[PDB]
Design a protein around this ligand. Structure first.
Ligand SMILES: Cc1cc2nc3c(=O)[nH]c(=O)nc-3n(C[C@H](O)[C@H](O)[C@H](O)COP(=O)(O)OP(=O)(O)OC[C@H]3O[C@@H](n4cnc5c(N)ncnc54)[C@H](O)[C@@H]3O)c2cc1C
Ligand SMILES: Cc1cc2nc3c(=O)[nH]c(=O)nc-3n(C[C@H](O)[C@H](O)[C@H](O)COP(=O)(O)OP(=O)(O)OC[C@H]3O[C@@H](n4cnc5c(N)ncnc54)[C@H](O)[C@@H]3O)c2cc1C
Ligand SMILES: Cc1cc2nc3c(=O)[nH]c(=O)nc-3n(C[C@H](O)[C@H](O)[C@H](O)COP(=O)(O)OP(=O)(O)OC[C@H]3O[C@@H](n4cnc5c(N)ncnc54)[C@H](O)[C@@H]3O)c2cc1C
Ligand SMILES: COC(=O)c1ccccc1S(=O)(=O)NC(=O)Nc1nc(I)cc(OC)n1
Ligand SMILES: COC(=O)c1ccccc1S(=O)(=O)NC(=O)Nc1nc(I)cc(OC)n1
Ligand SMILES: C/C(NCc1cnc(C)nc1N)=C(/S)CCOP(=O)([O-])OP(=O)([O-])O
Ligand SMILES: C/C(NCc1cnc(C)nc1N)=C(/S)CCOP(=O)([O-])OP(=O)([O-])O
Ligand SMILES: [K+]
Ligand SMILES: [K+]
Ligand SMILES: [Mg+2]
Ligand SMILES: [Mg+2]
Lengths: 593, 593, 215
């Protein structure tokens, strides 16, 4: 009655297949090899889920991340032992830093060969320990259903993140001969008082601000409740890179993105706020600027008993990790918002505060040097063009990126309006993410427009996965901002290393011939007069498509809060300064750059 | 006098640069990023070594491995923190399993940010612990020269292998202000008795055999002394995959490669030998077959005091790990051979033993089904063609491979004659190795012909590095054996899973258009009548070149010792069996395969 | 020996295989092996400017001051010069002469209610070789509210003299972190600190608390 014998007679591989079904897995990303063959044999021609084959297991890993971020379901990876498993390490570290539910199943050499430096043996449980929430090696088939349940549960609860389950070949080839507990075959007053205290604090605030991040995206009602709070108590809203789309940026209350390359208006507002409502965001060091100089008005208000930081956070590890919370509200931010909002006083107007908020927004747009006659397309202009044109299809639009300047310009210059539409490597910052993440997001949302805004260097990292998009039937749209440089690094070299560009110009392939070789449509935009029509052709395509755009080189991302500086101590765009910088760069490089 | 102040006033990055010089580093493989910028600034426009820029840090890692195996020098890698570092994990695990001296320098976030889940922070010391001999995080600039010396020393002594040195950005930006020990600024009777005992054993042997591996390649005199021993005591010689080229395979005493896919003659000989002289080889599980059934005549002879296993091994970990040595001779095999050979009796003839050796060689060639009119090129034939034609240039020829059937056919069908000419991933078996390893080997040996014999799937893994070959001026020769399948896995699926090909057919790009996009010469051989002239064009090219050859599909690598079987219990090629197999495959797949 | 005795002192272990210690050295070895900042300077100046504004200073001294023979001497010199009451941790006991009128005795879970009251009311806390352990701070969010308020208003805060970066900003935010040996850094600090003859209102409170809260 409490024991189940329905799996007796099945191989570990067959049991794996059945547990995928029970966990409602509809997609698996993976790549075969000797140690994992018994599992591949069990899932052979399965009509229970879609299997997606990359060209490299790093591709499978980032695809599964893109899938998970787009769908809100765990991304499932199935790879072989040894190099198949070590190739998923960067995607696991990536998923860990960005809170992405990844369930990685790696084949392993037979238990009889473990520890012998066996053929294709890696200590993946040892290697992946630091880049997973949890991992395990299954030692017998009777415990395989339990370990699969544990993996999915850990991956998806608390702060979501990656887990790894190591599967020795003899375990997955072995047959279950014994019944197993049937439970294994199937998938506070303290906080209540803190919420009340937090509401009393917000009800005193004269300069409140919401600082919202990825955690609000982890409940479907999150963005709705965020809006309900901002509307009720009349509060301006800034988000992190990972929170983009949690708040409708068309709302007058939107302050846009904060941080190192965020709006100087948002950065100014949080530096002057007396009450900061932190909703599912971890105060990472790209956001806070100089920590000792962060949020001085909120710290003063906390000291004077009239404000502070109200931190809604699900992981105790991240409470009081970076900044002291005046009130820590532990648990799912969306559930706790349901308790919080009714205790919060409705506020009709905040004339002095919004007068400041509105002047800062007017004073601090995302300015840059516009095109001039004969100049190359500016990368900021390109992003605006894509954003304006994409918003006109009757389809959801999901954006993935690589890492570098193009990523920041995508963040700044798209207009973000919907949750789970910005899928970008933030904490680890992995170049190469953009293309496989887009394939995974496209598989998750087959009716969406999915656009990978990519850098040339980033794209070079994982371009082989173009074949994977075709083979998977994923009509992704890749836009390579070709500045022929690792722009983010050259930006730092211009600024801090006197224009000494040390190994930051990789040679690029011919992207149009590359696309052709991969059986992907190719478009190349080389001048200002091709921008609008080329972007329309890109978006109108109904097949995978690679758009290359030639863009201005040696252009900094601004605003910028340099290392060591307070959040409100930012560099702003200035036309004359940019001209002088260009002249200095030219002199210093003998006209090379 | 014992203290040195000559580095005072230098940054950690400048100190790094100077220590590279002192360690005679002439090549660095790497890729920039924020945390490692102070080092990149110091090496800016250095004329002291060549810098090689890949498209992906995995590429840098495998390039450095190829470089190290071709040159006998350590391969030096320089990457940034976070994903730059985690991307080198597969190459480190690879180097560890194959005994490759790799010195990996990874940038790290400032010491003030370590442990805070910082921007681009990975616990690379934790993650790489299992896949390095040793690693360290440098905590201050005064210890940086010492840690660099330690890294090179550990990487290159004992069994060579990978090490990692983690470099926090604030350490490499900081300036040395204090003098440091000058030593840090600059780079047995028991065994003697064992050698004598070992010689007395060999002098009794009536059926000796040398089993030689990678360790003999780690001294320039190794192959010479191997030959001197085989000549003096009249002993047949077999090698591992990694020992290929240690012995001139044209010598009548050559038994070729042993093991899972080695010659049935070599496998028969070692199963019947009364004395096995193991020279720098680790009895890995691809070589021994069923361990309990391995070398029964040598074990019997050991018991009867007239033979056994004489193991010349530098790493105590690998002595008596898999098989009991009758005599363990610890230390460098080449140095110990110098002591050993004079104690060994010269033997003019061994009529009965060599009569058996010669009949086995005649009985067990590497047979396969030849081309027939209209058939595709057989992959075995292609390898023979490349080997015959390459051997006719007045240049050294170095071969790298991917992983799979093509790798085994390269091993079997090339004629190996020179040390450090087979550069292949053996222990970990990493698909994608072939191309970057070839670039690294080509940089090490600019006047060599370097041929990457690659599989289509393997090539797909890291094909982006074609641009890197061009940018580095490395005129590598890539031959893709295009069977449009992961052949080694389909071989196992045909044999053990009743022709159920579960996800083992990845779609390929157009390799000729791909080559064009990468600015690489492209050649495509599609039929038997183009084989000779196409291979000549390939070898005659003086620029990087990609040759695609369409080859027969669903062809097994034979001979084969299946899992669980004794080394002399092998499957041999049989024409009629192959015909039946083809018919069965056709029936079972409804004519699809 | 070097690791055990530098930075924050602590234990090390060296494992000695019997065959290594029985074996005989046969080769020569490097002779060195046979024998045994502007940023901080600016922080010290900033810290002194803060203390020179303080109207209710208190020294919170621990074990680190015992790690230099001159430590207690310099602690006394500072307390005397700027006229500051001194409390210590359990591990700092003996760093300050408890017979001195400026002694507040031990603070913490079982420390003097006078010391605990004083640190809760101080506008400037000079933390000298002490790690804010949880036996000392009480409820962390309610710890040192007058010092946190003063930090916010630019007239005080916590000046943390600490040798191990791990223990800086670990528990409580330092207004100024002064990294390195506390005794050496005190030698730079004290000359920048203004001599104070009297603090009538503060010591009036300190003296009433001591009278009110004996053991
Ligand atoms: C080149 C580059 C530049 C960058 N510059 C910026 C910048 O200027 N601005 C910026 O914002 N980012 C920037 N980043 C990204 C930055 O490094 C971080 O990735 C990002 O700020 C983290 O955002 P987050 O805190 O919302 O998300 P996360 O890092 O995912 O943190 C989410 C937090 O919410 C918690 N949480 C999760 N789920 C729940 C739940 N259900 N309930 C409650 N809490 C939950 C988590 O435990 C966690 O503490 C940059 C990245 C790169 C590569
Ligand atoms: C698909 C595939 C099939 C394979 N099938 C086969 C096969 O059929 N046959 C085969 O041989 N391999 C095969 N392999 C490769 C196999 O897995 C191992 O990589 C290989 O056999 C190891 O060879 P080795 O022992 O010579 O080298 P290593 O693994 O490098 O071991 C060298 C040994 O020598 C020692 N050593 C190093 N330097 C010195 C020194 N200076 N003095 C003394 N000792 C030293 C090392 O410590 C070590 O113990 C296959 C690989 C793949 C991917
Ligand atoms: C039953 C019990 C009750 C207790 N109750 C109390 C109590 O009421 N009050 C109390 O104080 N303790 C109490 N403790 C002790 C408490 O747990 C800690 O051990 C103690 O408070 C630590 O004191 P410390 O910070 O001075 O020393 P440590 O823990 O040694 O910390 C010293 C700090 O100074 C730093 N440092 C070291 N050397 C130098 C240097 N040369 N320069 C600069 N910095 C340096 C160290 O890195 C470290 O951060 C109790 C213990 C027990 C068992
Ligand atoms: C992946 O290797 C192992 O899992 C293993 C490792 C050590 C001992 C035994 C084994 S095993 O269970 O027998 N399996 C194999 O060997 N499989 C194998 N598969 C292929 I495809 C190819 C191949 O060899 C090329 N081997
Ligand atoms: C690589 O990041 C770090 O090393 C780090 C991590 C945490 C805190 C401080 C730091 S730091 O020393 O200041 N350096 C940066 O920040 N560098 C940086 N570089 C780029 I190019 C780009 C970039 O931001 C996009 N940052
Ligand atoms: C080298 C580097 N960062 C360090 C680095 C190295 N390696 C990896 C895998 N990831 C990162 N983030 C960057 S952001 C350059 C990105 O160049 P790009 O992709 O052409 O983008 P862009 O030119 O727009 O800045
Ligand atoms: C999937 C696989 N092995 C598992 C595997 C998975 N992933 C990695 C990174 N490495 C390995 N070795 C092989 S050998 C197929 C190789 O196919 P190929 O490169 O086209 O070679 P071939 O067809 O000649 O056998
Ligand atoms: K925007
Ligand atoms: K051969
Ligand atoms: Mg670029
Ligand atoms: Mg193939």
């Amino acid at each position: 009655q409490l024991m189940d014998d329905s799996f007796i007679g099945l191989t570990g591989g067959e049991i794996f297949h059945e547990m995928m079904l029970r966990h409602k897995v509809d997609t698996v990303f993976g790549y075969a090899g000797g140690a994992i063959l018994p599992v591949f044999d069990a899932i052979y021609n399965s009509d229970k889920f879609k299997f997606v084959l990359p060209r490299h297991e790093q591709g499978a890993g980032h695809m599964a991340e893109g899938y998970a971020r787009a769908s809100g379901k765990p991304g499932v990876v199935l790879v072989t032992s040894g190099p198949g498993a070590t190739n998923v390490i960067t995607p696991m570290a990536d998923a860990l830093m960005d809170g992405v539910p990844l369930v990685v199943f790696s084949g392993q050499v037979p238990t009889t060969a473990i520890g012998t430096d066996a053929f294709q043996e890696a200590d993946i449980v040892g290697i992946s320990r630091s880049c997973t929430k949890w991992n395990v090696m299954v030692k017998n088939v009777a415990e395989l259903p339990r370990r699969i349940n544990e993996a999915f549960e850990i991956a998806t609860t608390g702060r979501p993140g990656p887990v790894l389950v190591d599967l020795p070949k003899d375990v997955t080839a072995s047959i279950l001969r014994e019944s197993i507990p049937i439970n294994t075959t199937l998938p506070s007053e303290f906080t209540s008082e803190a919420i009340k205290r937090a509401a009393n604090i917000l009800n005193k605030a004269k300069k409140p601000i919401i600082y919202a991040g990825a955690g609000i995206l982890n409940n479907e009602q999150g963005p709705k409740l965020l809006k309900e709070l901002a509307d009720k108590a009349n509060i301006p809203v800034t988000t992190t890179l990972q929170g983009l789309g949690a708040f409708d940026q068309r709302d007058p209350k939107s302050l846009d993105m904060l941080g190192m390359h965020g709006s100087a208006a948002a950065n100014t507002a949080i530096q002057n706020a007396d009450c900061i409502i932190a909703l599912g965001a971890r105060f990472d060091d790209r956001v806070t600027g100089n920590i000792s100089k962060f949020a001085p008005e909120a710290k003063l208000a906390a000291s004077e008993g009239r404000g502070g930081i109200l931190h809604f956070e699900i992981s105790p590890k991240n409470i009081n990790k970076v900044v002291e919370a005046t009130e820590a509200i532990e648990g799912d931010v969306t559930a706790n918002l349901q308790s919080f909002i009714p205790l919060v006083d409705s506020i009709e107007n905040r004339p002095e505060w919004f007068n400041k908020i509105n002047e800062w927004k007017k004073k601090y747009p995302y300015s840059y040097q516009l095109e001039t006659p004969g100049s190359l397309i500016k990368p900021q202009t390109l992003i605006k063009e894509i954003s304006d044109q994409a918003q006109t299809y009757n389809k959801e639009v999901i954006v993935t990126t690589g890492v570098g300047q193009h990523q920041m310009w995508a963040a700044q210059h798209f207009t973000w309006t919907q949750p789970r539409t910005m899928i970008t490597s933030g904490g680890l910052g992995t170049m190469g993410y953009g293309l496989p993440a887009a394939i995974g997001a496209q598989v998750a949302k087959p009716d969406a427009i999915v656009i990978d805004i990519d850098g040339d260097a980033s794209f070079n990292m994982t371009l082989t996965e173009l074949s994977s998009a075709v083979q998977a039937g994923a009509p992704i749209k890749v836009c390579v901002l070709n500045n022929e440089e690792q722009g983010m690094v050259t930006q730092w070299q211009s600024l801090f290393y006197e224009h000494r560009y040390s190994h930051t110009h990789q040679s690029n392939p011919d992207f149009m011939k590359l696309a052709e070789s991969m059986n992907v449509k190719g478009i190349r935009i080389t001048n200002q007069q091709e921008l609008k029509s080329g972007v329309k052709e890109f978006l109108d395509a109904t097949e995978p498509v690679l758009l290359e755009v030639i863009v201005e080189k040696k252009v900094p991302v601004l605003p910028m809060v340099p290392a060591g500086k307070a959040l409100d101590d930012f560099i702003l765009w200035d036309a004359e300064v940019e001209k002088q910088q260009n002249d200095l760069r030219k002199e210093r490089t003998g006209g090379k750059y």
